[PDB]
Design a protein around this ligand. Structure first.
Ligand SMILES: CCCCCCCCCCCCCCCCCC(=O)OC[C@H](COP(=O)([O-])OCC(O)COP(=O)([O-])OC[C@@H](COC(=O)CCCCCCCCCCCCCCCCC)OC(=O)CCCCCCCCCCCCCCCCC)OC(=O)CCCCCCCCCCCCCCCCC
Ligand SMILES: CCCCCCCCCCCCCCCCCC(=O)OC[C@H](COP(=O)([O-])OCC(O)COP(=O)([O-])OC[C@@H](COC(=O)CCCCCCCCCCCCCCCCC)OC(=O)CCCCCCCCCCCCCCCCC)OC(=O)CCCCCCCCCCCCCCCCC
Ligand SMILES: CCCCCCCCCCCCCCCCC[C@@H](O)O[C@H](CO[C@H](O)CCCCCCCCCCCCCCC)COP(=O)(O)OCC[N+](C)(C)C
Ligand SMILES: CCCCCCCCCCCCCCCCC[C@@H](O)O[C@H](CO[C@H](O)CCCCCCCCCCCCCCC)COP(=O)(O)OCC[N+](C)(C)C
Ligand SMILES: CCCCCCCCCCCCCCCCC[C@@H](O)O[C@H](CO[C@H](O)CCCCCCCCCCCCCCC)COP(=O)(O)OCC[N+](C)(C)C
Ligand SMILES: CCCCCCCC/C=C\CCCCCCCC(=O)OC[C@H](COP(=O)(O)OCCN)OC(=O)CCCCCCC/C=C\CCCCCCCC
Ligand SMILES: CCCCCCCC/C=C\CCCCCCCC(=O)OC[C@H](COP(=O)(O)OCCN)OC(=O)CCCCCCC/C=C\CCCCCCCC
Ligand SMILES: CCCCCCCC/C=C\CCCCCCCC(=O)OC[C@H](COP(=O)(O)OCCN)OC(=O)CCCCCCC/C=C\CCCCCCCC
Ligand SMILES: CCCCCCCC/C=C\CCCCCCCC(=O)O[C@H](COC(=O)CCCCCCC/C=C/CCCCCCCC)COP(=O)(O)OCCN
Lengths: 53, 303, 64, 57, 121, 56, 459, 175, 104
């Protein structure tokens, strides 16, 4: 059981996340983009309620 | 390539082989103490090489070999620091420990559990080497607690004696009082600097606030037996003379001071904590010398 | 056996509500709770006010 | 004195379990202590009928 | 839901004719298996009470217990399924016949809905 | 001795039989939740030349 | 998930049909095999969960608890095999049946995709424990203990049921997935306050909270060794699992309502740690240590941060293993001494050295010595509390100091010193007891190598 | 080493001085490393060649998993559970990727601090600024969600922040 | 082997029950002194001197030499507090007040 747990497949997506971050940083650094953005969603598709106060 | 890493990890690795062999047949014979002493001497003469390389070049390293759990943006890994402090303190500690076991060969000649005594000494040496070479705060805490537990076990070596158990519990109590400040410093460093690594801690703290340094100072006072938490060090002389010579005189009791040495980049940027440290040291040395100048037990005077 | 029984099992049947016992129980069982509640509440309101004014400098504060 | 005996063994025991036990014992004794005389039960039934007629309408 | 006065209900009918338009429960239904298990437990208790070898006293008696339990469970499952089908049919018919009490909600995306945020501190 | 140790060691087969029956019943319950097989937006896929279902 | 449930159900027929002198061997072997089977649930995903079906699902919070529950049964059987030697075959089979039923109920409880099913199994676990405590108990007070262990629980759990069904009338579903995805904020109202209390106190009573911890010393002292093991290791974690599952809908009202329970736990940890210092009973001391650790877990759950949840899961697993080991060691002492008093038998290290080593390791792992998972959970909870408020560190450090004090006090009083002269029936420790200690301790030192396996879904 | 890309983890050209023995005494360091080479490096290298040939005899490959893009929580209906599930899974994947990005930046910072030695305060200002930017972004994204975090809560926090920003900008423009 | 009458009871109010309790705890009636009758549940347990076990005679042949206790003699209510590993009340060469003042 200890050997089975030790060699469990990477279903938690640790190496996958690391490789995705590697390629994403490689893209953004080359393109000059400011790494991670402050907004998790694109503000263009968010419709704010206008106050008019 | 670059034998500095191989040698500086091999010393600590070969320091652990007799612990592995403690379940073998050699542990049941009378050649076990000689085995441990020979291992320690070989470790010292092997660690003499990284010291030579550092003196020649000034070479320093960080060896982050094994990756432990990663917690969101915080990464914990088995990382060893081989700066000037580690590569200089390891040979001295190994030399002193070699001398101590050679002395204990004759001093513990009539003790039935002499192999267990040598195993305890080696385990304390391993924990102290873990403490000295630690690159992050969790490994430093591991060494901090290992040396304390080994001191507790060695003070109460004669467990039929009430006073030995009392002294061991006293030492544990005072070291936990220091542990409070140690844990406070760990929590503050993780919360604000987002890491326990020494490099990130040094980088993100250009002007260190009071609280983490006060926690470190409390931990150092607890482990080094400053004036507030001093009596456990005098009371620790209940253990066998090799234990008093190795742990409570030259290697373990300096550990707290070593901690304040490790965080000196943050120490110099704060003035109040420096004043507190200086005052505590002065009052401690004065009070301890004044108590010493009138004792009758020689071991108490040396402590 | 007498020592253990008197220490553990003989306490309540001999208990009597007395001004000494009532006051001591109220103190040692209520006072610390309200004291720590006041301390933590004051600290957390101070921290929340500092966050609302934005003068706390929470840079590099990622793990919580 | 305070942690073990005063609070853990006495007052925490007095508040939740012992008070409940005493109250339930008292109410059970009061309710069940009927001598078996149908006169009292019938008078109580008459009082209940009057209360129901004068209160639930 | 009080179906006692539902129109066109035969008084003492266990299973109406329209219930025959519903799929019968399978012979391997887990509820039927549980009813058979209950019958087996009843047989074991019957053996235990009468001071007989519990597992192997009466095979015919235990098998009769299991069979009767399975029979009654099958018919009970049929009636239960019919009643639930009736309830769903009535609810859907009432929703269809009364559109003004069940209006069609305007579909809005989370990008145009303002939900208050409560920080955890 | 066969037909003698069986009367005493037949109880050892109950748990593995229960395990294999539980695996079969897990597949039983799995087979009833295929309403979205090869239909999620994340794994919309064209079937292989000799493939009928993506997962069983 | 039935690949685990069905073998546990088949454990009953096997026990009853088993030869009169082969019940223990078959039960132990097949329970260990079932634990090996349940080991497969550790392979979790960073995605939602392991949704097996509409009725049962797995998670990296449920997986370690399920593994521990499956692992505990062989240890319970090995511990119980000793004192049931003079007992008739039918009643020994009944004892094994109670243990198997408890394990089955716990296994079904930890999956519980729906909250009403979770409540049903969570309250069904009560009956076998009550039967075990009130039937196979030594002292005359066991009955009283059982009553306490019953009614306290129900006093907290009956309102919860009402709240639960009320939620299903408002939300429309008590399924955990729909509840998480469709969660809406709670308005600060009296009705919402009382719904919060009804949802919370049911799990707070079983942890137990400092105010409501009275039943635990009685239940732990008067129960047999298996009862003490199952109470300390798994049954206390049901409240924590329920709280972590149910606090999703309680926000944002949790911020205001957490204060009384946070204060109660932060002071009751100190109170129980100090109570441990003056104790003339081993089982009572272990019970109060369990109360302190579960109070820390309550603080972690109420803080409601990712580090809080990770430390809470790690601490529950570590505390379960450690408390089971401590109870086993105390029972091994009691079986020789028959007094259950710390000061009566002394200097046992002289007579039983390997058992003294087991005692030392148990005390060290209860002392939260790094890098044990006990220390990992304690440190994560401490850091989360410091982030919550910097003043909690004083109480946490005081608790650590008193914990070390009473742990080493327990070790020194029983193992060190001079042996009692008039006691001469102290026979060498058997292979069974040593194997029990080893099987208790090795998983802890193996799990410290892979902490992420027990850190929960927020890792 | 080809095992990792140099661009994500940049390194300086690592210039090193040449030995300039001012005296004729033989330094023990050179002889010590020569005997270390002869006694350690050669057998390890030979064993590595043996293992590498054995690996070359049996070659097989694994591929990095690729994920399609799915509509996020902003394009999901109020009670539509399928799109909400897909958006939540996508948001969790993005959260993990962001955590790994912050990990990479912190690794860069640690490496720079250790490498530059005594002049770490000046020679690693770029890494500190990069970490400040990425940490500010990460904190703005996920600081106060707490346990039971979700895409909806992140969107609500972003909406609150953007409403505050719009109000502040409107006030400043009309000030 | 312990009977019901050999367990602690309520506070003794008359001399007869005081003598009975003194006989129960294996001590003279003159030496017997229960704790003051207040709310705390001491019942009828001897209020032995608050002296610690460290300053008991270390040369007497005790049945438990480490604890310095005899077999059948009554046990102090706070025995676990005085076990030679904890607070001791041994007299000191200098008075308590003088040491307090000097240290402060
Ligand atoms: C240190 C390097 C080790 C490398 C070698 C590998 C060793 C593997 C051992 C694993 C643990 C042992 C199993 C536990 C049950 C004990 C078995 C037993 O009954 O003994 C019979 C056997 C025969 O004795 P006997 O003469 O027949 O009986 C006489 C009596 O029993 C009288 O008995 P006694 O008087 O002889 O006492 C027995 C002895 C030993 O018995 C014990 O008490 C064992 C307890 C050990 C830990 C205590 C719990 C605290 C939590 C730590 C968790 C870390 C685990 C890491 C992963 C472990 C993998 C399983 O007790 C001690 O010496 C006190 C130990 C306290 C040390 C405190 C320091 C803790 C932290 C150290 C660092 C660990 C991580 C390093 C990370 C950084 C460096 C890479 O004795 C032994 O085998 C002794 C074991 C060797 C000492 C181990 C202590 C250190 C090991 C720590 C854990 C493993 C570290 C892994 C790599 C570290 C680098
Ligand atoms: C989640 C659901 C899943 C689990 C289901 C659980 C329930 C299922 C069973 C329900 C009841 C049906 C069976 C019970 C009948 C009672 C008979 C009995 O006493 O046992 C004696 C009998 C052996 O003794 P004997 O040689 O006949 O003569 C001795 C006398 O009988 C009597 O000897 P004695 O009078 O000299 O001994 C005196 C003793 C005898 O007194 C008793 O034992 C009375 C029996 C217990 C009462 C049953 C109440 C009704 C069921 C309630 C279940 C509650 C569940 C909820 C959880 C809470 C737990 C309370 O009484 C006492 O010692 C007084 C104190 C006892 C402690 C306090 C009372 C606690 C009892 C609660 C037990 C509840 C679970 C029962 C489990 C089954 C036990 C047999 O046991 C058996 O052999 C029958 C056991 C079952 C047969 C298994 C055969 C199947 C294997 C082949 C087929 C393979 C299946 C798979 C197919 C695919 C494979 C290829
Ligand atoms: C007696 C004196 C000693 C003599 C023996 C001397 C030898 C000493 C060696 C023993 C300890 C020294 C430390 C050496 C550790 C090396 C092994 C380690 O690296 O493996 C760990 C593996 O350990 C396991 O992960 C942890 C053990 C599993 C825990 C499950 C417990 C077993 C089930 C029993 C029931 C559970 C009960 C409790 C409920 C939860 C971590 O592996 P990891 O770096 O990550 O990646 C593995 C490789 N990958 C990358 C391909 C994946
Ligand atoms: C405790 C568990 C339940 C056990 C019940 C006893 C089991 C043995 C009974 C044997 C068969 C009895 C059925 C009678 C045959 C025909 C019945 C039929 O003519 O009556 C119909 C109705 O059929 C019966 O009512 C159904 C009886 C079935 C009882 C089973 C339900 C048990 C509750 C769930 C627990 C699960 C128990 C499973 C194991 C038995 C028409 O009713 P109707 O004239 O129009 O209106 C009167 C009723 N109203 C007023 C409420 C509307
Ligand atoms: C015994 C061992 C432990 C067991 C468990 C104990 C923990 C349970 C305690 C529950 C927490 C407190 C309950 C209600 C807290 C609400 C906050 C309140 O205290 O603050 C003020 C509330 O004011 C006063 O407190 C009014 C209530 C006074 C009546 C309560 C009795 C006080 C002492 C009784 C304690 C007994 C509890 C146990 C009963 C068995 C704020 O005033 P206001 O802004 O206007 O109200 C805000 C709430 N609104 C918006 C819904 C209206
Ligand atoms: C020994 C006998 C065999 C000798 C021949 C083999 C020589 C070495 C070749 C082995 C291959 C290399 C190897 O072991 O793989 C690395 C492997 C892990 O794989 P990674 O991917 O790098 O990290 C895990 C995440 N995936 O590392 C190992 O497990 C072996 C060495 C690890 C360090 C040794 C363990 C000592 C410390 C034990 C744990 C201590 C507690 C936790 C530490 C706390 C620190 C804060
Ligand atoms: C509205 C009504 C609410 C009713 C609440 C019922 C609470 C459940 C416990 C009921 C117990 C009542 C019976 C009782 O206590 O009798 C006294 C009885 C006397 O012993 P006997 O065996 O009956 O006879 C000895 C002489 N031959 O005392 C006892 O032994 C009690 C010992 C166990 C007590 C059980 C624990 C009860 C308290 C736990 C919390 C429940 C409190 C109620 C809800 C709290 C409000 C949210
Ligand atoms: C704050 C901590 C509060 C104090 C904790 C009290 C814990 C009580 C329970 C402990 C168990 C009893 C016990 O250990 O026995 C007493 C035992 C025996 O005494 P001996 O001198 O060894 O006698 C032997 C000769 N016959 O003595 C002890 O170990 C008790 C130690 C208590 C110390 C408490 C005072 C510490 C205060 C420190 C304040 C100063 C801090 C320094 C500031 C540094 C900042 C940079
Ligand atoms: C170990 C013992 C612990 C006991 C736990 C008891 C604490 C739980 C709170 C008391 C029970 C309340 C159950 C309510 C179940 C939730 C349902 C709900 O909250 O809905 C509310 C109903 O709320 C209530 O009615 C609650 C009233 C309370 C009645 C019973 C009082 C019991 C004792 C109260 C005092 C104790 C308070 C703290 C107890 C803590 C335990 C020590 C809304 O009602 P509506 O009419 O539908 O609203 C329409 C208009 N918006």
């Amino acid at each position: 059981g200890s050997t089975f747990v030790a060699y469990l497949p990477d279903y938690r997506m640790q190496e996958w996340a690391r490789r995705e971050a590697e390629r994403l940083v490689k893209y953004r650094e080359a393109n000059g983009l400011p790494l991670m953005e402050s907004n998790c969603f694109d503000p263009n598709k968010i419709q704010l309620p206008e106050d008019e106060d | 390539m670059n034998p500095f890493a191989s040698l500086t990890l091999t010393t600590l690795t070969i320091l652990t082989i007799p612990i592995m062999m403690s379940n073998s047949n050699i542990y049941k014979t009378n050649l076990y103490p000689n085995y441990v002493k020979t291992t320690v001497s070989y470790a010292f003469t092997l660690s003499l090489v990284p010291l030579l390389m550092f003196m020649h070049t000034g070479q320093e390293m960080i060896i982050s070999n094994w990756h432990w759990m990663t917690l969101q943006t915080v990464e914990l890994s088995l990382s060893f620091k081989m700066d000037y402090f580690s590569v200089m303190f390891i040979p001295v500690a190994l030399f002193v420990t070699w001398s101590i076991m050679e002395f204990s060969m004759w001093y513990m000649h009539s003790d039935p559990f002499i192999n267990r005594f040598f195993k305890y000494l080696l385990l304390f040496l391993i924990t102290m080497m873990i403490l000295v070479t630690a690159n992050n705060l969790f490994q430093l805490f591991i060494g901090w607690e290992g040396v304390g537990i080994m001191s507790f076990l060695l003070i109460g070596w004669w467990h039929g004696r009430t006073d030995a158990n009392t002294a061991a519990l006293q030492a544990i109590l005072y070291n936990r009082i220091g542990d409070i400040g140690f844990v406070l410093s760990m929590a503050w460093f993780l919360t604000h600097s987002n890491a326990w690594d020494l490099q990130q801690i040094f980088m993100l703290n250009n002007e260190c606030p009071n609280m983490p340094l006060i926690g470190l100072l409390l931990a150092a006072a607890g482990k080094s037996a400053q004036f507030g938490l001093h009596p456990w060090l005098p009371s620790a002389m209940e253990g066998p003379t090799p234990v008093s010579a190795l742990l409570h005189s030259s290697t373990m009791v300096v550990a707290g001071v070593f901690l304040l040495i490790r965080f000196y980049p943050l120490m110099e940027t704060n003035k109040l904590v420096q004043t507190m440290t200086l005052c505590l040291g002065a009052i401690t040395t004065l009070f301890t010398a004044l108590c010493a100048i009138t004792q009758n037990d020689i071991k108490k005077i040396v402590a | 056996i007498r020592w253990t029984y008197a220490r553990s099992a003989n306490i309540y049947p001999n208990f009597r509500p007395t001004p000494k016992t009532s006051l001591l129980g109220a103190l040692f069982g209520i006072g610390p709770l309200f004291f720590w509640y006041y301390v933590f509440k004051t600290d957390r309101d101070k921290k929340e006010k500092l966050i609302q004014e934005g003068k706390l400098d929470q840079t590099f504060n990622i793990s919580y | 004195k305070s942690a073990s005996s005063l609070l853990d063994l006495i007052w925490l025991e007095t508040i939740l379990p012992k008070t409940t036990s005493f109250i339930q014992m008292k109410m059970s004794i009061m309710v069940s202590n009927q001598k078996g005389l149908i006169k009292l039960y019938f008078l109580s039934f008459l009082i209940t009928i009057m209360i129901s007629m004068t209160l639930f309408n | 839901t009080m179906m006692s006065g539902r129109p066109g209900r035969v008084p003492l009918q266990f299973l109406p004719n329209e219930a025959r338009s519903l799929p019968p429960p399978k012979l391997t239904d887990p509820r039927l298996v549980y009813m058979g298990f209950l019958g087996y437990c009843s047989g074991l208790i019957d053996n235990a009470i009468r001071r007989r070898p519990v597992v192997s006293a009466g095979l015919h008696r235990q098998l009769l217990y299991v069979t009767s339990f399975v029979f009654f469970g099958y018919y009970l499952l049929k009636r239960q399924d019919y009643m639930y089908a009736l309830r769903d049919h009535d609810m859907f018919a009432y929703v269809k016949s009364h559109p003004e009490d069940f209006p069609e909600k305007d579909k809005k995306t989370y990008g145009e809905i303002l939900e208050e945020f409560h920080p955890v501190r | 001795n066969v037909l003698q140790i069986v009367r005493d060691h037949w109880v050892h087969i109950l748990v593995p039989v229960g395990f294999v029956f539980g695996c079969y019943l897990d597949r039983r319950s799995d087979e009833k939740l295929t309403a979205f097989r090869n239909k999620s937006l994340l794994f919309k896929r064209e079937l292989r030349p000799n493939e009928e279902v993506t997962w069983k | 998930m039935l690949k685990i449930i069905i073998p546990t159900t088949m454990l009953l027929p096997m026990t009853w049909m088993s030869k009169h002198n082969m019940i223990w061997i078959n039960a132990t072997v097949h329970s260990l095999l079932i634990s090996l089977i349940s080991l497969s649930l550790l392979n979790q995903l960073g995605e939602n969960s392991l949704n097996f079906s509409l009725t049962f699902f797995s998670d990296s919070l449920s997986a370690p608890l399920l593994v521990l529950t499956t692992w505990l049964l062989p240890l319970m059987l090995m511990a119980s095999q000793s004192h049931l030697s003079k007992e008739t075959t039918t009643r020994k089979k009944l004892y094994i049946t109670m243990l198997i039923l408890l394990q089955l109920f716990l296994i079904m409880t930890f999956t519980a995709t729906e909250l009403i099913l979770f409540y049903i199994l969570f309250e069904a676990t009560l009956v076998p424990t009550l039967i075990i405590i009130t039937r196979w108990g030594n002292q005359t007070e066991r009955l009283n203990a059982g009553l306490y262990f019953l009614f306290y629980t129900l006093a907290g759990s009956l309102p919860l049921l009402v709240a639960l069904v009320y939620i299903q009338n408002t939300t429309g579903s008590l399924n955990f997935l729909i509840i998480h995805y469709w969660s809406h904020p709670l308005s600060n109202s009296w009705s919402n306050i009382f719904m919060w209390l009804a949802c919370i106190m049911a799990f707070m009573v079983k942890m137990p909270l400092y105010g409501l911890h009275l039943w635990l010393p009685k239940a732990h002292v008067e129960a047999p060794i298996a009862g003490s093991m199952v109470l300390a290791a798994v049954l206390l974690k049901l409240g924590g699992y329920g709280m972590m599952r149910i606090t999703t809908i309680l926000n944002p009202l949790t911020n205001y309502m957490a204060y009384p329970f946070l204060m109660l736990s932060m002071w009751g940890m100190i109170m129980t740690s100090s109570i441990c210092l003056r104790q003339t009973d081993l089982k009572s001391l272990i019970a109060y240590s369990s109360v302190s650790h579960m109070a820390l877990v309550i603080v972690a759950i109420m803080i409601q941060t990712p580090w809080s949840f990770m430390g809470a899961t790690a601490l529950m697993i570590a505390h379960g293993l450690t408390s089971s080991m401590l109870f086993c060691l105390a029972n091994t002492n009691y079986e020789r001494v028959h007094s259950r008093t710390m000061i009566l038998a002394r200097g046992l290290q002289t007579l039983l050295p390997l058992m003294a080593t087991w005692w030392l390791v148990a005390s060290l792992t209860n002392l939260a010595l790094p890098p044990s998972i006990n220390l990992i959970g304690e440190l994560f909870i401490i850091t989360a509390s410091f982030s919550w408020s910097n003043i909690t560190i004083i109480l946490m450090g005081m608790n650590m100091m008193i914990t070390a004090l009473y742990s080493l006090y327990m070790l020194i009083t029983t193992q060190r010193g001079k042996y009692t002269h008039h006691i001469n029936n102290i026979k060498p420790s058997f292979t069974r007891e040593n194997a029990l200690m080893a099987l208790h301790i090795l998983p802890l030192l193996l799990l410290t190598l892979n902490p992420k396996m027990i850190l929960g879904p927020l890792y | 080493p080809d095992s990792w890309d140099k661009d994500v983890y940049p390194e300086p050209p690592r210039r090193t001085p040449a030995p300039a023995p001012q005296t004729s005494l033989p330094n023990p360091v050179t002889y010590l490393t020569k005997i270390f080479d002869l006694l350690v490096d050669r057998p390890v290298t030979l064993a590595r060649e043996f293992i590498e040939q054995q690996h070359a005899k049996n070659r097989y490959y694994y591929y990095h998993r690729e994920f399609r893009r799915v509509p996020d929580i902003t394009e999901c209906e109020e009670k539509d559970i399928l799109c909400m599930f897909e958006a939540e899974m996508q948001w969790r994947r993005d959260y993990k990727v962001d955590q790994e990005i912050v990990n990479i930046i912190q690794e860069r910072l640690k490496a720079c601090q250790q490498r530059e030695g005594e002049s770490y305060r000046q020679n690693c200002a770029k890494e500190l600024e990069q970490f400040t930017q990425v940490s500010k972004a990460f904190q703005d994204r996920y600081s106060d969600l707490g346990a039971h975090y979700s895409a909806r809560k992140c969107l609500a926090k972003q909406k609150q922040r953007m409403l505050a920003e719009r109000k502040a900008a409107k006030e400043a423009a009309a000030a | 082997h312990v009977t019901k009458d050999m367990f602690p009871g309520p506070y003794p109010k008359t001399p007869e029950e005081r003598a009975a309790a003194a006989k129960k705890y294996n001590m003279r009636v003159e030496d017997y002194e229960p704790y003051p009758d207040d709310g705390m549940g001491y019942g009828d347990y001897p209020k032995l001197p608050d002296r610690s076990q460290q300053e008991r005679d270390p040369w007497y042949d005790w049945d438990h030499p480490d604890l310095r206790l005899n077999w059948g003699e009554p046990i102090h209510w706070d025995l676990d507090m005085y076990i030679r590993n904890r607070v001791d009340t041994s007299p000191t060469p200098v008075s308590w007040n003088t040491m307090c003042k000097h240290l402060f």
